[PDB]
Paper text:
Crystal structures show C5 and H3 overlap the ACE2 epitope, whilst C1 and F2 bind to a different epitope.
To further define the epitopes recognised by the nanobodies, crystal structures of the C5-RBD (Victoria), H3-C1-RBD (Victoria) and F2-RBD (Victoria) co-complexes were determined to high resolution (1.5, 1.9 and 2.3 Å, respectively), however, the C1-RBD binary complex failed to give high quality crystals. The results showed that C1, H3 and C5 blocked ACE2 binding whereas F2 did not affect ACE2 binding. The C1 and F2 nanobodies are oriented differently, the relationship can be described as an approximate 40o rotation around residues 102 and 103 of CD3. F2 meanwhile contacts L368, P412-Q414 and D427-E429 that are not engaged by C1. Comparing the RBD structures in the various complexes shows that Y104 of F2 displaces the helix of RBD at Y369 by 3 Å. By contrast, C1 and F2 bound with a similar affinity to all three strains. Incubation of C1 or F2 with the trimeric spike protein led to ill-defined aggregates on EM grids, indicating they destabilise the trimer, which would disrupt ACE2 engagement.
Author numbering:
A (entry chain BBB): 1 to 125
B (entry chain AAA): 331 to 528
The structure:
């Protein structure tokens, strides 16, 4: 069992910025691929970003490419999501996820064993 | 120069698949590993790599590759991963904690389930201790579950250690058969025998 807790969510104005963070339990954080998904009301969990063990393949959903940066600090068991130039369509619950494996199908929720409970991000217009 | 493609067809589309307890190994060597056939598949239920990115498989060289394949239930596929426990991880097929390789599975309900139930696929239900990584046990010794010795006769606390899956086409997805291929990548102090095209 790995536990995951998101922080840094909340209310922000369109064009604004937020840094989500997610901290993991355990002493083998370096062995985990870390990911962000989000879920808007009425929608399924949508892949946002993922980062491999070395940091070195990063992955992004089409609609956040260019605006969002995923990064990890192994010393702090933490993955970060820098969200710039936020739009109302970015409003959702943001979930931290983790898996030992890096998936060819990296956008599939079923490829990640561990999930945080999520944190609300709200972008007003 | 190794120039012939690695025969992935003979692994993924083998006419027969092993019971998990008697998992099959094919050695892959002295061949070009072109993974683009696997990249263009949509029907795999899982495709994860450990210690290498799936995006780099066509660029990497290994001293040795092994393809281990077998059938298990859908909801046991999560056990074919480093750091897992359960009947399958503990007693049938164990990956090491630092595994280097990929695990691919797909639903095989259309091939491996029958109207009467398919009882051909077996798994080890009992064992005195957990498998070491890549260990294989095909023994059928009566398992002593209790105080009394069994004298190789079945009965009270004296169980035959293998059990049948009994796959029916009407089973829930978690109880349907899944075929699994585990590609083990070795990087030893030896010549590389397997490279990608690039
Ligand atoms: C196995 O057969 C399927 C069709 O049944 C085909 O799509 C696939 O390319 C084959 N797999 C390999 C690794 O050759």
């Amino acid at each position: 069992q790995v536990q995951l807790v998101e922080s840094g969510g909340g209310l922000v104005q369109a064009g604004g910025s937020l840094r989500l963070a997610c901290i993991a339990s355990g002493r083998t954080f370096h062995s985990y691929v870390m990911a962000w998904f989000r879920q808007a009301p009425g929608k399924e969990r949508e892949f946002v970003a993922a980062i491999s063990w070395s940091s070195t393949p990063t992955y992004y959903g089409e609609s956040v490419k260019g605006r969002f940066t995923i990064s990890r600090d192994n010393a702090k068991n933490t993955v970060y999501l820098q969200m710039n130039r936020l739009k109302p369509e970015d409003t959702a619950v943001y979930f931290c996820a983790a898996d030992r494996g890096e998936s060819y199908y990296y956008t599939r929720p079923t490829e990640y064993e561990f999930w945080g409970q999520g944190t609300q991000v709200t972008v007003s217009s | 120069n190794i120039t012939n493609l690695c025969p992935f067809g003979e692994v993924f589309n083998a006419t027969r698949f092993a019971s998990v307890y008697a998992w099959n190994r094919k050695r892959i060597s002295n061949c070009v590993a072109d993974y683009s056939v696997l990249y263009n598949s949509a029907s795999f239920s899982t495709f994860k790599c450990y210690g290498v990115s799936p995006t780099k498989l066509n660029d990497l060289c290994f001293t040795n590759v092994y393809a281990d394949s077998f059938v298990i239930r859908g909801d046991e596929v999560r056990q074919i991963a480093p750091g897992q426990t359960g009947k399958i991880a503990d007693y049938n097929y164990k990956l090491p904690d630092d595994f280097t390789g990929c695990v691919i599975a797909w639903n095989s309900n259309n091939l491996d389930s029958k109207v009467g139930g398919n009882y051909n696929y077996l798994y080890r239900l009992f064992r005195k201790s957990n498998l070491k990584p890549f260990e294989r046990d095909i023994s059928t010794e009566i398992y002593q579950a209790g105080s009394t010795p069994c004298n190789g006769v079945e009965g009270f606390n004296c169980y035959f250690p293998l059990q049948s899956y009994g796959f029916q086409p009407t089973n829930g997805v978690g109880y349907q058969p899944y075929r699994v291929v585990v590609l083990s990548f070795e990087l030893l102090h030896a010549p590389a025998t397997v490279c990608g095209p690039k």
